[PDB]
Structure formats: C-alpha cells, structure tokens
Amino acid sequence: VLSEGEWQLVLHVWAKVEADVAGHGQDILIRLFKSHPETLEKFDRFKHLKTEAEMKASEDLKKHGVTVLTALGAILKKKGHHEAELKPLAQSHATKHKIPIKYLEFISEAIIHVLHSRHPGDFGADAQGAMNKALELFRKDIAAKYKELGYQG
Numbered sequence: 276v277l278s279e280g281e282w283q284l285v286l287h288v289w290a291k292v293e294a295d296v297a298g299h300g301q302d303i304l305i306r307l308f309k310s311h312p313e314t315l316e317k318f319d320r321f322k323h324l325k326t327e328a329e330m331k332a333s334e335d336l337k338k339h340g341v342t343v344l345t346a347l348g349a350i351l352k353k354k355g356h357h358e359a360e361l362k363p364l365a366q367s368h369a370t371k372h373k374i375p376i377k378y379l380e381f382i383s384e385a386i387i388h389v390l391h392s393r394h395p396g397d398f399g400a401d402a403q404g405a406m407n408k409a410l411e412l413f414r415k416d417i418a419a420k421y422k423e424l425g426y427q428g
C-alpha cells in the first residue's frame with residue numbers, strides 16, 4: 276500500500292508527463308523494444324520496425340504510446356483504487372495480446388528510465404522509489420487477475 280506521501284511523489288512527476296504524453300510514450304516504447312526485443316514481436320502492428328530511427332518515425336507507434344500512458348495515468352490517479360480500470364486491461368493483455376507479467380516488469384523499467392531522463396528535478400530517489408512501488412502495485416494486481424484466468428505461469 277503506498278502512503279499518501281508516496282502517492283504525492285508519483286503524481287507530481289506524472290503531471291509533468293502529462294505535458295508531453297506523446298513524447299514520453301515514444302521514448303518508453305522505443306526503450307522497451309530496444310532493451311527487450313522479444314516485446315516488439317508481440318505487436319504485429321510494429322514488428323516491421325527494424326531500427327530506432329524507423330521507430331521514432333512511426334506515427335502509429337507514437338499513437339500507441341499515448342494510448343498506453345493515458346491508461347497508466349488513469350490508473351495512477353486512482354491511487355490504488357483501480358480495480359475498474361485494471362480488469363479490462365488484464366483481461367486483454369492475458370487472453371488476447373498474450374503478454375507475460377515479466378514484460379510488464381520490462382515496461383516499468385523503461386517508464387522509470389524515461390521519467391529520470393526527462394524530469395530529474397522531480398524524480399530524485401524518493402520519487403523513484405515511490406514510482407517503483409506504484410508500478411509494482413500495478414503488476415501485483417494484474418498478476419492476480421492473470422492467475423485467476425490461468426495465465427500466471
């Protein structure tokens with residue numbers, strides 16, 4: 276359970292992301308796909324992209340970055356009371372998109388890296404620990420719905 280102090284750190288940095296959702300979305304997806312190429316293969320939409328420059332040029336990938344960070348932002352702003360927003364996301368990611376929990380760990384690492392690069396004055400170590408705990412809570416609750424459906428592995 277995050278404390279109120281920790282939620283404040285999280286959402287303070289997140290408000291900064293909200294000034295340039297698309298730029299962040301791009302940088303996060305690019306880092307995820309460069310860091311962990313097996314993730315790119317889960318998107319039939321993007322698996323033609325073979326270089327970072329092609330990724331950076333893809334308007335469709337920038338569109339999807341906005342979709343992902345708008346959904347994450349809505350879950351963060353519920354401060355833990357996010358069951359209505361995770362249900363559908365876990366459902367689709369386990370049964371339709373087939374994303375293992377470990378790749379949710381990978382995208383959390385890429386979110387933390389991009390927020391440290393773009394917002395270092397609002398993302399010192401207190402705020403990095405808090406964002407880590409928020410993203411862990413997201414993964415714990417998606418993992419519990421996976422397990423329900425037979426996809427925790």
Ligand code: HEM
Pocket residue numbers: 314315317318319320342343344346347363364367368372374378379382
């Ligand atoms: C912060 C973590 C994530 C969030 C909030 C998120 C959010 C979303 C949303 C809102 C959609 C469209 C609605 C839906 O299908 O449920 C979506 C689609 C999808 N996501 Fe995620 N996602 C995350 C992590 C990932 C990861 C780590 C992968 C793959 C490694 C992935 C793969 C997919 C795929 C394949 C689609 C369908 C894209 C398409 O072909 O249109 N997601 N995601």
